[PDB]
Amino acid sequence: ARAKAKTRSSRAGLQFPVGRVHRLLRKGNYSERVGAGAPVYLAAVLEYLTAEILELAGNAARDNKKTRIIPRHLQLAIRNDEELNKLLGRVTIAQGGVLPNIQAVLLPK
Amino acid sequence: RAKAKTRSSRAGLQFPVGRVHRLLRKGNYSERVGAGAPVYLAAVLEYLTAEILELAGNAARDNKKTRIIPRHLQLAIRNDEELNKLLGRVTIAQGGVLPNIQAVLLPKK
Amino acid sequence: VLRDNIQGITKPAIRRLARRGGVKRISGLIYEETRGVLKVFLENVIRDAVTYTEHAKRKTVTAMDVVYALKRQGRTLYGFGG
Amino acid sequence: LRDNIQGITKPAIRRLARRGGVKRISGLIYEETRGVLKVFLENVIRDAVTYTEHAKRKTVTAMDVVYALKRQGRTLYGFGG
Amino acid sequence: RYRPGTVALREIRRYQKSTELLIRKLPFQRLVREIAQDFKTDLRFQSSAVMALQEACEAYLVGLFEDTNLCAIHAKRVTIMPKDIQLARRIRGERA
Amino acid sequence: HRYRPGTVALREIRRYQKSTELLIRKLPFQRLVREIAQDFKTDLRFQSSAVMALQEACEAYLVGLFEDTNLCAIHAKRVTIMPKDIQLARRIRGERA
Amino acid sequence: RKESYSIYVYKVLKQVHPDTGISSKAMGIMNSFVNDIFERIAGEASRLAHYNKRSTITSREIQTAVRLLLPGELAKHAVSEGTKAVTKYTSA
Amino acid sequence: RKESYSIYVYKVLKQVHPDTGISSKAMGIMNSFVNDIFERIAGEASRLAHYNKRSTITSREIQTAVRLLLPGELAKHAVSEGTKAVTKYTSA
DNA sequence: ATCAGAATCCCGGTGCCGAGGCCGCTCAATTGGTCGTAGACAGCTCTAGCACCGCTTAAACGCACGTACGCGCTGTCCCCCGCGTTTTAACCGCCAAGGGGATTACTCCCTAGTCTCCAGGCACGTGTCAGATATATACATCGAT
DNA sequence: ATCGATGTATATATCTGACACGTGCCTGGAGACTAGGGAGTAATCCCCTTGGCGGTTAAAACGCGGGGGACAGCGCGTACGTGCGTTTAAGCGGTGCTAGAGCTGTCTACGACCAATTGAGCGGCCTCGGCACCGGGATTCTGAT
């Protein structure tokens, strides 16, 4: 009889769903065929990026003394990080606000 | 079996309907392609080609030339508002620039 | 049915937007120029969104239509995809 | 090998500025222009070499450069064939 | 009575801390419905669609004002003028 | 019959906006491209058309940048382009310093 | 053996300018333009089919992609050309 | 059945910040970010397969697409994570 | 206005090399038949988008007044342009070598497709606690003295 | 400095509505097996990239004088900011109603697939005309007078 089912996410040591990513790759018209390791690699990359953003946003929330992450903390995390800002440069975070910035020449004498 | 006709001749076009259909099938664009999609795409491509070629030929004639060179294509594209809007982020190799000097730099009197 | 709605973008609202942009002093001619710029931007986004709505045989513009219209203008928007 | 950025000479930069319509050029412009061109070239060449390495090739082709420019929103016409 | 500029700096600090929408909702909704009449008649709108349009428009205008402020400071001014907006939009590649 | 300053510059602007040839010498640019590419992969070969395409893209990019820099200089009531003008133009474009 | 659009571009040129020729470098520019526009329209049509949960790209998707990608009066004439071509094709 | 990434994003947040919660609006932002990055990597990998006349998307295409899209130090660590995951998966 | 001299335009003659035409052949487009399912159309559910009313109160509006700032003008000096002379290196052609890109053939192992099974992940429900609001109050900041 | 007005920062309590956890089931993911074709690998060939050398001439580099452009300082007048009293309409809560979005079922037209055929398009060869280059006369333009 069948062995106990083991999720491909658990095999690869991941939190993000490998099977769902595989299904999305197969149905997106990206190619005729999808290799076995492509969903694993993609899920790992997506999980890593999510972890980086969540860590920066959690730090921004803690500095604000808040225990919840809101879009403002995500915007602060993205705009204050050079690489994340470079990756998400053309993106608008809804209710994210702006970085507080005043030109020096505009400051009082 | 009848005398075979090209689909371009049926649609009254100079651009190849069959090649466009094959490029749409090879493309990874959709699972299926309708019968009128290659005809429509070929007609649109032919119309755009004719527009650019007419403008470039006018530019060449205005220079007393009988052969279109990349310079004439650049002059045609940059002098037409719609084509300039469509080809805004495009660099024509060996095309040059539009003659344009800021009026403030012109000699006084 | 609707007329002169661009005036609804009042001078204090434009001032608030410029304050968020860090502007200190604002010329009086800025307000009409800003209204024109906003109208052009909105016209382009709404045109693409309505094209998406018409393609789907729908009579209602959804947030996904607006998101796709923005996406195709190089202005990706987060937070409205679900 | 070594000091190649100085091969982009002052008269060459003046020619490029003249085609851009510039009438008068400050003396500090040449170094700034050299830095700008170096950054642009580094980005494009990095992308093109990634494309070359993926194909397991040792030779950079014009198609690699065209793809690298295309993915930076700098589409180039006249080298695709 | 505060000197000119103190209240402006306080307003800048206040509006750069917050994240709420700075344009009133009903006038913007009326503007959106008026603009869309030229493309299709009897068009309905999801409320989230109008909210998405407002978020996009306000972000676009705030970014434009940042660039305009840079252009104004380049000409040794503290006041933004229409020519600053025109220069910023021209350098961005936007339609005049 | 010495020409006044700015006359020869205007003549050069006319001449170089009328023409389409490349304005950077090919052999120094090729050396620059090979030197830059060495930092990503060693023992790299280049097709001649690849270097030609790179040079075309580079010259086009720099000419467009000089146009935007000229506009920035005219905005500040000057006729001379300065590094601050290039920096402002690149900043408004959204390019990285 | 490398396929291109040179023979159809030349046919179109002879239709619009009978006495005018074209150099090889300009032909390369034209081939790049045709390929670029084809890719733009096909990508937009594929996205439109994906958005509406359809598996077929038809002339309706091409028409909508043209209306999305071409500016102003270019879109109107291109749409008219496509409709006329399809009408002629289906009648024959 | 409206699928999303909220449960996996929540697990990742609990891994990196066990004390910290997230509002639903910020979760929507996270879902949009994940979808966007998926689209970018998948599109680049598809273009890479088409450029080399291949019909399969493998982990090489994903790695090259990540190298093309992610900047600087982000690309290095993402490549490390993907390689580690593939190696672990290949060993069951 | 004048007039000398450099730069440019025009008109003609020569030559060369690239565009354009012709021919063989092969392989991609066409035709005809079959069949499976995508999507077009009709019908029903019930969500949500629109219209309207009344109240409240915050925001917008209009006016007055002061001064901060934009802009024009002038003076200074330095740093860019124009030009002549010396140096240097790009470019062209010619020759050699070998590296690696493209192609073909062979094999096998990796992925799609089908079927069965089951446990993950999503709609529904609900409680409790994070942050907003309220109030009091310290306190740093502006600004004229 | 210095005190006053005041918007802002800090401390504590209340509550409410949104987040975090629990449950059922169903529908998407996993395991097993087979076929076949995509891709990896080895050998081959020939083309195209790299290296070297000599000359010769155009371009780059350098130096120098000067004038014009950048920049600082000052004056002035007007246009913007700030504050206050009035008015306008945005926001909110509630109700009613219907357009239309979403889902399901049926069925047929349409697009994939396959095999055979042929003509369109490709690659190679050849030639002759468009374009470039040169030289000399005419016109323009610039700068000092």
A10 touches strand J (CB under 7 A): no
Name beta bridge partners: F45. D59
Going by their DSSP bridges, the two strands C60-61 and E44-45 should be labelled as parallel
Q: Which of D75, D78, D80 sits opposite G25 (nearest CB)?
A: D78
CATH for E1-96, among 3.40.50.620, 3.30.420.40, 3.40.50.850, 1.10.20.10? Answer: 1.10.20.10
* Lookup result for tokens 């694993």: A40
User: Measured over all CA atoms, what is the biggest interatomic distance in chain A, rounded to whole angstroms?
Assistant: 83
Q: Is G22 helix (H, G, I), strand (E, B) or coil?
A: strand
Q: Which residues of A fall within a CB distance of 8 Å from B29?
A: 29
Beta carbons of H39 and A16 less than 8 angstroms apart: no
Residues 30-59 of D with CB under 7 A from strand J: 59
Distance A43 CA to I117 C1' (A): 26
Distance E9 CA to J9 C1' (A): 18
List, in order, residues 6 or more apart from A86 with CB less than 8 Å away: F96, H71, H72
Query: Is residue A81 in a domain?
Result: yes
Name beta bridge partners: C77. A92
Please check whether residue E12 touches C, CB under 8 A. Answer: yes
End-to-end Cα spacing for chain H:
31
Rounded Cα distance, E33 and C5, in Å: 9
Chains E and F touch (3+ CB pairs under 8 A): yes
Residue C18 Cα distances to A72, A94, E15, E21, angstroms: 19, 18, 9, 13
Q: How many domains does chain D have?
A: 1
Structural fold of domain G1-92: Histone, subunit A (1.10.20)
Best of D66, D77, D79 to disrupt the G interface (most G CBs within 10 Å) is: D77
Tokens of D16: 């490029």
The CATH number of residue B49's host domain is 1.10.20.10
User: Measured over all CA atoms, what is the biggest interatomic distance in chain C, rounded to whole angstroms?
Assistant: 48
The burial class, CB within 10 Å (0-12 / 13-18 / 19+), for B103 is exposed
Task: Give the residue among A25, A26, A68, A67 at the shortest CA–CA distance from A43.
Answer: A25
Neighbours of H2 (CB within 10 A): 4
Phi then psi for residue H17, to 5 deg, are -145, 80
- Sign for the CA dihedral angle at F40, F46, F47, F53 comes to positive
Q: Which of C48, C56, C64 sits opposite G68 (nearest CB)?
A: C48
Nucleotides of I under 7 A from a protein CB: 4-8, 18-20, 27-32, 38-40, 48-50, 59-61, 66-71, 79-83, 89-91, 99-102, 110-112, 117-123, 130-131, 142-144
Rounded Cα distance, E57 and D45, in Å: 36
Distance D65 CA to J50 C1' (A): 21
Rounded Cα distance, B14 and G6, in Å: 12
The burial class, CB within 10 Å (0-12 / 13-18 / 19+), for C56 is middle
Best of A18, A48, A74 to disrupt the H interface (most H CBs within 10 Å) is: A48
Residue G44 Cα distances to B89, E12, G67, G79, angstroms: 18, 41, 10, 15
Neighbours of B94 (CB within 10 A): 19
* Amino acid symbol at H20: T
Phi then psi for residue B102, to 5 deg, are -60, 135
Tokens of B45: 């491509």
Beta carbons of F55 and F29 less than 8 angstroms apart: yes
Let me know how long chain F is.
Answer: 97
Q: Is E32 helix (H, G, I), strand (E, B) or coil?
A: helix
Residue E67 Cα distances to A20, B27, C81, D69, F91, angstroms: 42, 41, 29, 26, 9
Beta carbons of G53 and B3 less than 8 angstroms apart: no
List, in order, residues 6 or more apart from C8 with CB less than 8 Å away: E24, E26, E27, E28, E30, E31
Beta carbons of D30 and D22 less than 8 angstroms apart: no
Rounded Cα distance, A98 and A56, in Å: 16
B3 touches strand J (CB under 7 A): yes
Continuous segment of H or E residues that includes residue F45: strand F45-46
Rounded Cα distance, G78 and B46, in Å: 9
Rounded Cα distance, A75 and E19, in Å: 10
| CA B33 and chain centroid, separation | 24
How many Cβ pairs closer than 8 A exist between chain A and G? Answer: 3
H9-36: buried (b, 16+ CB within 10 Å) or exposed (e) per residue? bbebbeebbeebebeebbbbbbbbbbbb
Residues 73-92 of B with CB under 7 A from strand I: none
CATH number of F1-97: 1.10.20.10
Cβ <8 Å between G36 and D75: yes
The CATH number of residue C61's host domain is 1.10.20.10
* Lookup result for tokens 């937009």: G44
Beta carbons of D16 and F23 less than 8 angstroms apart: yes
Q: How many domains does chain B have?
A: 1
DSSP secondary structure of chain D: --SGGGGS-HHHHHHHHHHTT--EE-TTHHHHHHHHHHHHHHHHHHHHHHHHHHTT-SEE-HHHHHHHHHTTT--EES---
Q: Which domain holds residue D69?
A: 2-81
Beta carbons of H27 and H12 less than 8 angstroms apart: no
Beta carbons of C22 and E12 less than 8 angstroms apart: yes
Angle at CA B37, nearest 5°, toward B31 and B39? 140
Beta carbons of A43 and H66 less than 8 angstroms apart: no
The burial class, CB within 10 Å (0-12 / 13-18 / 19+), for E27 is middle
Q: What is the 3-state secondary structure (H, E, C) of C12-66?
A: HHHHHHHHHCCCCEECCCHHHHHHHHHHHHHHHHHHHHHHHHHHCCCCEECHHHH
Q: Is H21 helix (H, G, I), strand (E, B) or coil?
A: strand
Rounded Cα distance, C6 and B94, in Å: 45
Give the orientation angle of helix G59-69 with respect to helix G72-91, to 10 degrees: 160
Q: Which domain holds residue A106?
A: 7-109
Residues of H with CB under 8 A from a CB of C: 2, 4, 25, 28-29, 31-33, 35-36
DSSP secondary structure of A15-80: SS-HHHHHHHHHHTTS-SEE-SSHHHHHHHHHHHHHHHHHHHHHHHHHHTT-SEE-HHHHHHHHHH
Residue of chain C whose alpha carbon sits nearest to that of E5? C24
Beta carbons of A8 and H89 less than 8 angstroms apart: yes
List, in order, residues 6 or more apart from G54 with CB less than 8 Å away: B30, G61
Q: What is the resolution of this structure in A?
A: 2.4
| CA C4 and chain centroid, separation | 16
Experimental method: cryo-EM
Distance D25 CA to I82 C1' (A): 14
Name beta bridge partners: F20. none
User: Measured over all CA atoms, what is the biggest interatomic distance in chain G, rounded to whole angstroms?
Assistant: 49
Rounded Cα distance, A6 and A20, in Å: 15
- Going from N- to C-terminal start, the domains of chain F cover 1-97
Q: Is A81 helix (H, G, I), strand (E, B) or coil?
A: coil
Rounded Cα distance, A39 and B56, in Å: 49
Tokens of E78: 């503290």
Cβ <8 Å between B45 and G38: yes
Going by their DSSP bridges, the two strands C25-26 and A33-34 should be labelled as unpaired
**Minimum distance, in Å, between the CA of residue H63 and any CA atom of chain D:** 10
Query: Is residue B1 in a domain?
Result: no
Neighbours of G31 (CB within 10 A): 19
